[PDB]
Write a structure and sequence with these properties.
It is classed as ribosome. With about 90 residues, this protein is mainly beta. It has one helix spanning about 35-45; strands spanning about 1-5, 5-10, 15-25, 65-70, 75-85, 90. A 4-stranded antiparallel beta sheet has the order 2-3-4-5, with no helix packed on it. A two-stranded parallel sheet has the order 1-6. The radius of gyration is 19 Å and the shape is elongated.
Length: about 90
Amino acid sequence: VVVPKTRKTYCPRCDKHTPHKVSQYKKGKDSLHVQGKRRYDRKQQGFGGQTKPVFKKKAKTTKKVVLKIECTKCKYKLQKCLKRCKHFELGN
RNA sequence: UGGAAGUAUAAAUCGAAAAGGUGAUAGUAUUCAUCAAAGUCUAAAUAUUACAGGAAAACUGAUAGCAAAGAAGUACUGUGAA
RNA sequence: GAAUAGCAGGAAAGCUAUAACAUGAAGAGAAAACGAAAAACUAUGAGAGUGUAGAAAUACAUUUAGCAAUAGUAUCUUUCAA
RNA sequence: GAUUCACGCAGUGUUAACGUGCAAAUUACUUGUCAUAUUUGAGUAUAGGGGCGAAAGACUCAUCGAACUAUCUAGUAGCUGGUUCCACCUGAAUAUUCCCUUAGGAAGGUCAAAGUAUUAAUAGUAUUGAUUGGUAAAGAUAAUGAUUAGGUGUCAACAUCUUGUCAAACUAUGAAUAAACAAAGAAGAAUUCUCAGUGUUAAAUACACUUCAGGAAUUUAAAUAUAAACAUACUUUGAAUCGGCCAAGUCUGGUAAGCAGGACUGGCGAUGCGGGAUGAACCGAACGUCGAGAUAAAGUGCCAAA
RNA sequence: AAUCCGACUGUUUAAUAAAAACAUAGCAUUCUGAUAAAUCUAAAAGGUUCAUUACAGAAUGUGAUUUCUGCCCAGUGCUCUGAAUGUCAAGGUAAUGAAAUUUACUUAAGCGCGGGUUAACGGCGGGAGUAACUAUGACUCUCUUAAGGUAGCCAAAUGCCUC
RNA sequence: GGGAACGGGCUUGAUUGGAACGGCGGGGAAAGAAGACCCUGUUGAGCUUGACUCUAAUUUAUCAUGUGAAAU
RNA sequence: GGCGGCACAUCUGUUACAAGAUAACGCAGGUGUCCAAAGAUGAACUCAAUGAGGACAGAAACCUCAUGUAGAAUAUAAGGGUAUAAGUUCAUUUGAUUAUUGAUUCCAGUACAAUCAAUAACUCUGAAAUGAUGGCCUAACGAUCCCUAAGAUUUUUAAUUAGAAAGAAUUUAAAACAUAUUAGAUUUAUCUGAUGUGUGAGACCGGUGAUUUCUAGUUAAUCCUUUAAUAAUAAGGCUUGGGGUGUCAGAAAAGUUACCACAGGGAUAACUGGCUUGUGGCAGCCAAGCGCUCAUAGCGACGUUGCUUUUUGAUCCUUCGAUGUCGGCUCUUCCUAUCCAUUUCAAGCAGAAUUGAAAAAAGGUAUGAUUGUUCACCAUUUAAUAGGGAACGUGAGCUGGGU
RNA sequence: AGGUAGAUUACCUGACGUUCCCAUCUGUGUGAACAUAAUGGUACUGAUCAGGCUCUAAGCAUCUUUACUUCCGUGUUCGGAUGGGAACGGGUGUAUCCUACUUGAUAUGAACCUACC
RNA sequence: CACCA
RNA sequence: CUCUUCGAAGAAACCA
């Protein structure tokens, strides 16, 4: 919900408790050269229409929040998942 | 297509060479290996339920075995394919 | 009786072929890279004797053996993980 | 593109005949119509997601909301029907989990057949001992709620002492029936001596685990009842089945139901026999072929043995 | 003697419906200058209307005559002689990199915006006041989306209640 | 009467002489037809539509090198 | 069946039967969230309410004493738990973290998810013992494939120095041409023959030693693969999160058929029959009253007990390889809960006309306008113009008006 | 006898009063520093002037409560079993198990380690 | 607010 | 999900 930045948590690389910078994880841009997309492009060529299922029955109204707790002095990132919340804000 | 950043064919466009192709993960570089496309022919080993001529059978024995053991694709039906 | 090559006999049958390979002898890992002993231990257990007695068969005591199986262990190979 | 009759034609009515017919659409009377948007012969043109239609999804060789014919083709069916000799032995199911699952499947239970092990590997039972539960009951100024009245104190009110009646979603208390242990398996006990490795520990000779670490002597087969060696423990492979129905000194919905759905058991299904006249379930009792005898439920005026 | 439907002559479900159904003349709408419109074909110096030429060809609705066709362009259609940088493709250009690649800029129609159109598909309701006793509302106002059922006609082959 | 709750067969009764002719339409839950109403099936077909996925026709842009100028 | 609802994933009490399991479209409710504090810890305090007091101030404002077992609060539904707390206030903090095991709950003893017990790090709070791997407990949620993020420095190797200890290394037929040198030609991005050499070579004589190992440094490279060798991009691996399937063990999906078709079904509706009888119809018991007086001539409220299957329901037992489904016409028979005629009793029965009741079902119980109607409502006639059953009698008896 | 620590967690609680303090405990005095809050009331620290007034501890009462015992009462209910009776509803007999509320009688704590008296 | 029959 | 305007609209997009 309202979680702050500047967490002081354990860093596996340094084996110590160091200050961390907390942000939110956003899904990166889809690449056009990965195997799954390359395979999909070949399949969609030619006649046949839509060759793969298209999801059209969503039910979830929220998504799980994943923080990116990044070590300040060693750049070691940790991915921590939170419970489902409708409104999430990065505090002070 | 098993060939997966394209294995093969074809169409639209493009289009080489003081040669070059391939080493199946796309890219550039340097080595290595192995071949040298875009013309032609070529016996032998292989297939065969057309058809013809033979020989065999733990095959059937006239409601069986071919649809047909007699003038059987005959008699008979349909405008006709059948 | 892998194709296949020979033998007598004339044979869809029979016999002979130091043989490619198939399954197995070693297992784990996605892969690179690897690749098994403390010549094992503990428990219960199959069998064999000897003596005494009832007295017919058979029952008690003692010495020895420790297979199969089940469980638990030390050790060893591989894996991030047994 | 007036009114009518006739040769012809059609098909309004009888909802007549006929309806295994004269006929896979016909007959009789009645009616309408009977030349210019008329009737009709032959030739010719239009073909199956096509044609043709003054339009009915009508017609396209008795075939039309997509002709006929042959091939793919023995199309697919969780659905329906059938599935072929005898005797003997054993003998079921309707729970649970998942499925685009609900007329069907897979894991699992019941069951059969094969193959084993001397076997810390018997119990749908009772007793004794220590427990667990919150049902039936009971209670109601005992907690939570419901509810009738009467005294006393400062109309009512509020206190306080009685009184009558209550709860599936109230409870102090709390059975009967039940649930899970123990009644001597590191292998049938116990004691004495000796005793090590780790660790706990302030340190240990305490304590914990180590086959009641280990080793050796002495004593020893005892420790509720009952039953159990064709006992007990299974292992592997697999079939069928998961539409169920009935009874009740049981319950929930419903006015109730041969209604709907459950807890425990016994049955029917899969089951004949004796009795209830007859009856899937009730009562007695479960079946190799027979002879004789006592019996069961229930009967003994006749049918009908007594 | 009247009522309903169809104007009339005509056609129709071969074999249960001959009619109020179809057709019809009349009315009206749309597109097209012929190298066109419609439209058959896989293609085609291919084919039909077309031996044709707007008094024509092609595509539709209503259904003789008389009388009348009310209001609405908001939505969906169709159209425009409209605005440019709202959104829109492969491509084209440029930058980086060793190269693939990556990034940026620019591009048509279409939709969106604006206007026209109902004999185009269609729609024609609410709320608040108000007339000298009685209700109503000729007349104001006020949104939802645009308009608020006009001339007529009726328990109708169209009205549940309803005999 | 009970039974699958409407028997020709079973139980208990009523009652019965064998073969039949012309009629008739109560019964044989009479015949004709693997219900056509209803439901089920992960069975179809005709038709409709901004249901999903597509496609012919239509349309728009780029490519496919005629010369000779001129501007952008 | 549809429309409605979700009993489809899921939690609380009760049904539910004092172990476990446990039904219905049973009952009363709940979930798809919320929280940097409402997580962790330490300290202090005690809540609701009542009595008595205190200016405004009143029943509800704030203060004080006394009693005060929680009658308050604890995010939420309900049920559990809680008083030097789990509630209220203050203070510090991020354990709401990393890695590895073994179990328990659903369970097929699968996954997901949840609940725990330990070990190794690094931390928070407290003086300390302890406590902390989210919320006091029971719900608060998610596969394969695909996409998208985070992680794989600890260590293991090669090279060159310094030191040290162990090591003959296999054995006669040769082409690639890097080159040097000439010969024949050419001007071009110039080539074409042949002769030497090394390369490329390998047969050591107890000792040299090629070669491997060890130590200490130093330089480099380091998670695996892209299969002839490397390199920087790119791609694929391995582990763990997120993007979701609510039909919640997880297809990608609009209607209508009255023109319809097939496989089936009494597993299942529309008609009889069968159980029931709420509803309909009919009949009783009691006696508050009405009936000028008078409960009972005739009625009987408030309660209450029955019968029928002539209405409609409720159910789904028989029939889906078919039991012809409304009404009328024609015809026979049956029931009595009697409308008339016959015989009786009673009256608030003077006569007449009526009303209540008993025996009795052998005989009778009509004609028409409207409607397909059953039903109804009218106009008459009659001694009366009663109510019903027979597969809602009766379609190889008719009709076809309705459906 | 008292105080510290407890284990059983009402026979230990609650109300009305009563008895000592000789030690101990408590209440009692003060605010300088540690420390404390709005308040030296709490908590903290320094002390010993006085007091059994409260606490605490011991005892009383036809005391509420609580804990054992009988009785309630083999009454409620219950497991097994009829061709037992009843139209239903419900209720026997047989071989068995057996509460609760209430009322009456009793009790109102037992016990462990250390120090001091 | 009542669909099929 | 992108772009664009004033938590509402417009165009375009769509393999868990």
